[PDB]
Amino acid sequence: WIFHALVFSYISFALISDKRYQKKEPLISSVHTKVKGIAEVKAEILENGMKKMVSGVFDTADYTFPLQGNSFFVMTNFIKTEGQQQGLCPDFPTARTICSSDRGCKKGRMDPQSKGIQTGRCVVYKERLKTCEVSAWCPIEEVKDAPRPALLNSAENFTVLIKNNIDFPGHNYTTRNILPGVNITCTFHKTQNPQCPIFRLGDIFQETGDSFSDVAIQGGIMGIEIYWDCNLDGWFHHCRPKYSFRRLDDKTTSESLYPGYNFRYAKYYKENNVEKRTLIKVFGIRFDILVFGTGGKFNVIQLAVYIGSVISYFGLATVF
Amino acid sequence: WIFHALVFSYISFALISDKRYQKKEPLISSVHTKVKGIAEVKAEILENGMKKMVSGVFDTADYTFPLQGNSFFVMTNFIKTEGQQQGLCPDFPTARTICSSDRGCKKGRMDPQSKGIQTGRCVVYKERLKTCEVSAWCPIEEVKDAPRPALLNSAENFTVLIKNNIDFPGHNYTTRNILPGVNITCTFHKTQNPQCPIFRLGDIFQETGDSFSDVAIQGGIMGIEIYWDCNLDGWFHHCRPKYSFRRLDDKTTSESLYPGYNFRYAKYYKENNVEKRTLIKVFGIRFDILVFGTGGKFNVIQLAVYIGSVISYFGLATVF
Amino acid sequence: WIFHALVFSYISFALISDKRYQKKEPLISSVHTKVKGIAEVKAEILENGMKKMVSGVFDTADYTFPLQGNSFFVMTNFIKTEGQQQGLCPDFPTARTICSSDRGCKKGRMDPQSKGIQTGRCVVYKERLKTCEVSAWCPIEEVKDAPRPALLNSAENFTVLIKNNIDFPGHNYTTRNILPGVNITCTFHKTQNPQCPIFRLGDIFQETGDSFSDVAIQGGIMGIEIYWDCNLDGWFHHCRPKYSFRRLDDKTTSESLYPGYNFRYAKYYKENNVEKRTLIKVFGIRFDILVFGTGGKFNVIQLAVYIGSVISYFGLATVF
Ligand SMILES: C=CC[C@@H]1c2ccc(OC)c(OC)c2CN2CCc3cc4c(cc3[C@H]12)OCO4
Ligand SMILES: C=CC[C@@H]1c2ccc(OC)c(OC)c2CN2CCc3cc4c(cc3[C@H]12)OCO4
Ligand SMILES: C=CC[C@@H]1c2ccc(OC)c(OC)c2CN2CCc3cc4c(cc3[C@H]12)OCO4
Ligand SMILES: *[C@@H]1O[C@H](CO)[C@@H](O)[C@H](O)[C@H]1NC(C)=O
Ligand SMILES: *[C@@H]1O[C@H](CO)[C@@H](O)[C@H](O)[C@H]1NC(C)=O
Numbered sequence A, B, C: 001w002i003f004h005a006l007v008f009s010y011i012s013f014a015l016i017s018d019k020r021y022q023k024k025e026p027l028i029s030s031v032h033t034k035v036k037g038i039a040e041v042k043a044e045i046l047e048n049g050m051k052k053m054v055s056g057v058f059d060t061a062d063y064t065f066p067l068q069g070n071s072f073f074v075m076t077n078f079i080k081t082e083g084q085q086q087g088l089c090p091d092f093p094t095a096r097t098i099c100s101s102d103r104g105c106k107k108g109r110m111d112p113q114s115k116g117i118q119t120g121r122c123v124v125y126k127e128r129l130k131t132c133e134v135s136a137w138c139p140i141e142e143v144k145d146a147p148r149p150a151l152l153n154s155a156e157n158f159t160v161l162i163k164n165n166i167d168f169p170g171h172n173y174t175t176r177n178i179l180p181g182v183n184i185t186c187t188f189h190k191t192q193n194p195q196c197p198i199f200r201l202g203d204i205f206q207e208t209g210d211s212f213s214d215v216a217i218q219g220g221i222m223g224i225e226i227y228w229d230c231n232l233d234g235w236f237h238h239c240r241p242k243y244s245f246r247r248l249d250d251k252t253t254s255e256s257l258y259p260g261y262n263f264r265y266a267k268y269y270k271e272n273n274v275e276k277r278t279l280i281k282v283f284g285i286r287f288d289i290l291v292f293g294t295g296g297k298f299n300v301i302q303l304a305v306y307i308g309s310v311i312s313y314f315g316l317a318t319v320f
């Protein structure tokens, strides 16, 4: 008859383990993000084989755009080009783009890595180098890598503040991430201060374990997962988040798969009543706020059906 | 034997009410938003202690950007600054920025509220006021509040149209918000017209109960929740949405937590072959369309398992 | 006694097919999209009744913006206007905008289709036509349709690459779309190459079944659904996606419902120290990546409860 008891204990254990007496529903989320911290740039780069110095200050209206769909981007490196205008000009001489005669390359060709429409006419590029030029924005951008020192090497010193508002539509519950009367100043830590949401990017990378400068050179994507494990029962009610970080990139390191994160952006203006654009190749770190969770409440129907299921189980256990 | 009959009524009630004979699956959504209504601005503001008049017209391409990830933003108030250019200039004199001696403040300091890198050199700012200047965009913006009258005071007269398309991947079902042959002209009302989705922002606030001007001055976030309670059974088939609204903000009213919604935006240009930006501090209302819902079809497996698990409930009650 | 066996066969069939021994949990996703392929524009349009020629090249930084919240936009057609500036100017002559006397139209009117604030003063517009002018951007844009040939007629020749990274929070599992050591060069096909994610816009339209030119003229929204049916049990483990394509639009073709996809964009500049904006009316194809899927692992509790539920189901059928 002791066996008749043991299953009962197991049953209770199972219930207490997973709250089968709790109708559970998914989560609806709203995220608001504020990034603060100014950056100083001062370094020496090279363009067209000529050295130049770049200096300036970025004031959080310059190196990012407002949050849109749970993803706020943070600039870390750039390659500049100015004076682009519509015309014909020789393309950056590569193996596929080199020629000695106009008949070498065909007009209208669209090489995947070429940024201009080819007219099939080989012309001298520079110092007796011959390539068949393209009709595009000119002068053509030189395809190189981002400068080895981080142009915004002070990126990890920034601070991001996150306000998360969760609501469950089944139950009548909506609550925020920050409760009234909380510590304003913070620096998020796993154990020292695990609740206030002020994140330092250096802290994020230290938790992840990667080198911030290396992935900042080529850009990358990561995510700040927010876990809401809330119980709505009055007897034991607690609804508090847990923060985790994870690198969302793959570290492919293959040229064909576009390693890291980067894009191209254009600024237009009028010079001498002529349209002229300047091109910025931006490498950055893209943060995602992946908030997920479940919320449940005591419900009679789930308890009844689970008891009905367990009844036959222990009846059979007694039978055999 | 009546006790053997009350369980039948209870089980039928539960099965009919919660629809246990249905395979409930989540929802996949697509949202498309169009905002229409022009606005006129005409007011008197003050900059550097001098009064100026601002007037103009915004044409639904000037005060918003296209929908991106279920969130379309609407401008409400702005603070302007022009002639920004790289240099060194005294910071806006506050308690943490004032100084009387050169050694008063240290070079390289980055105050959280200061927008420039501090070089630690106390210089006269204006009428014998001394602060240690910063090397940044100049002249420095004056941190003030948004003007008490709403610069976009005619914001609540706008009209927003929402087209929602839901698909369930389990079942072969996809349907839209607007059925063919429906009233074009509308103004959404709780009871007068509860289905056509033309929303007025003033009505949006009126349903919530908050004053439009107060939230508009400092900005805020609210949600337009769309609830799809659809049943796919042929006998009782109805799939129509219900519209609800809520304020997603917190009303913190604390300076340290950045009350309301605002951001900073820049427009670059060339003046005398010199880079010059102009800065806009934007306060606005960011709308979110938080769509959720469930749907299910009749399934033999769910009905069979529920019947098998509910049989023991009366099988035992007969014994006792 | 065979009836005792048919129920066992049915139970085993249901358990194997629908996987009752699994703890099914939702999916968390991250998407990274790269669009490549240059476009050339060369055509003849008409503005103000005068013919003009438009030519140029778009280089994947001109006709799109970076991915933001699972939606990347692609240019396909545009209408240009330049020289806009704040002032008073006659509105485009329509039925609601025409007048013969000043008292005919009342000041302050806001017609839904009018883009300017009306001052109620009938003035000559062009060759003895009379309309009451509006205080707005000038000269007023002429409301027309997009040019019948596709300005971005080569749009279907572009290539889009998609990197999807999924994680399940319940189990300790995260995986990406592309496995190491895969074919780089690709063109997606239903049967020839169904796994590598390089998509051609012409290919996806062909799979959908609609012509590219007609949809591109007025714009539309379609989704790239990615389905992850992953099983985490070690015995039979396979986590590979299935690609499906669908058109998210409605084909309303009604003027009041804004058929197709389009918006208005502005570029600002300074000419003769006067602010002057230029307006672009954009018709484009907005792509969505609607990712969804489920995954689960072997769990003792689900197996136990399902057996306890089916025990009564077979026991009662044994009785009768
Ligand atoms: C890419 C983000 C910032 C971008 C950038 C990059 C390099 C620069 O120096 C070379 C810039 O000038 C100083 C800027 C200016 N901003 C303004 C904010 C901004 C916002 C954007 C964007 C680009 C920019 C560039 O794409 C969509 O949303
Ligand atoms: C912030 C939204 C509108 C912005 C703005 C603010 C103040 C102004 O008075 C000087 C503006 O001129 C009339 C404009 C013009 N637009 C164009 C649309 C637009 C779109 C944006 C944006 C800013 C703007 C500014 O940030 C990302 O997406
Ligand atoms: C609307 C997308 C592209 C837009 C456009 C339209 C017409 C043009 O001439 C015909 C343009 O010049 C070549 C451009 C340039 N870009 C840069 C990228 C871009 C990005 C955007 C945007 C507009 C543009 C315009 O709205 C928010 O995000
Ligand atoms: C970050 O800030 C700390 C102190 O504020 C400073 O010591 C450190 O050098 C900074 N790092 C960078 C990369 O600017
Ligand atoms: C909104 O519009 C109504 C009528 O169109 C007008 O009476 C009212 O004054 C307007 N409100 C604002 C703030 O412009």
Ligand SMILES: *[C@@H]1O[C@H](CO)[C@@H](O)[C@H](O)[C@H]1NC(C)=O
Residues within 6 Å of the ligand: C153, C154, C155, C157
């Ligand atoms: C697309 O490309 C193919 C081959 O690259 C070419 O034959 C075809 O004409 C192109 N279509 C357009 C519209 O440019």
